[model samples]
Target: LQSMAAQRQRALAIMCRVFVGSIYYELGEDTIRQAFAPFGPIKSIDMSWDSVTMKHKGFAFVEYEVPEAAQLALEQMNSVMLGGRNIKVGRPSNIGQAQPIIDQLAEEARAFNRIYVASVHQDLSDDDIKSVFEAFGKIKSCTLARDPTTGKHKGYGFIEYEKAQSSQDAVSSMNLFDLGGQYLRVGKAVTPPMP
Candidate 1:
């Protein structure tokens, strides 16, 4: 029985990680319930605080109904712009086993069409970002982040290639170096979850 249990753990391959930020702690239980409940059936939400220092760790472990759902959440919500800050997403402290962990990581590593470039010398235009990435493959869409009121470059945005292979190629071939003055990050576009 014990040996079988270990084998089962290996099968699940869970990729659990902590979400960091003081904003999460400030939001409290209500936010957790509101944000995660809609994504999937949540097994538990462990939001704790340090006893003496009284500083919010800015991270929590949220278990989902399934490995796929958690992977989806991490892909969609990780590094998301919430409360005027880009949050970091990672797997939790203790992982369950091997299979599930691989599944989750696989999901996290899934290909994407979107690319977000940063460390801009100054504001860049859609044409500029597009010209550079388009060399790798055909672009389905190119959108630069903008100021809602003034309609100016937000310094970062997305470029969607028609094919995932093209996106993968771009990441492997081009990413993080000198960019006319700024360094950049290239990866998938986080689309809203399907209803």
Candidate 2:
């Protein structure tokens, strides 16, 4: 009896995508990415969101560039506890199998809330950042990329908003409104495992 290739070929031709379930509503796309990143290069993840609360809807669809990666992702992630609960990874039955890839493409593109800014003072506390930028929208996080032990802000870092609209408003407002010594360089930043 064949073990791997033939089984995988059939799986791919029929229902090749990975479906993740029991996700925590508070978890964001990056949280999902953090888990699946080891499998392979993810093509796109169609993470369901509650339109009202803007939180995850307890499920997601992860599409990988390679079918083999999806196989391992499901095998390893099944029953894996995350966000204080066990997460389920498996194949899409009938529901997400018919979804267009382009539609899923629109999903991850919404992860633009984290923005990086430069030319700002290091002493700006988190509250000060929230104070200035809250006029645009709510702040989700403020980080100056310092060592956890030292608690030092390195004069340049990222500030994030709960919504992309907030990030956009803050970016534009600061980019042109340095009002000073130099220019406020605000731009998009990546959500790394952040050190």
Q: Tens digits of per-residue lDDT for model 1 on 1-195?
A: 778556544543344333544444456655755565433445677776777857546666776533444554566567776555566656664554455535443454344455444333346688877888898899877776565798876455567787888877886766555667655545443331110
Worst 10 residues of 1 by lDDT: 186-195
Segments of candidate 2 deviating more than 4 angstroms: 1-15, 95-195
**Candidate 1 deviant stretches above 4 angstroms:** 1-18, 21-112, 192-195
| Candidate 2 C-alpha lDDT tens digits along 1-195 | 356445433444434468999997667789998787555456688899778986778999987643435655776689998888899998877635434432332343346476665544656665665576677787877765554778975445567788888888776677534523534456554322121
Count of residue pairs whose backbone atoms collide, per candidate: 13, 0
Name the weakest run of 10 consecutive residues (lDDT summed) in model 2.
101-110
RMSD in Å for all candidates: 12.2, 19.0
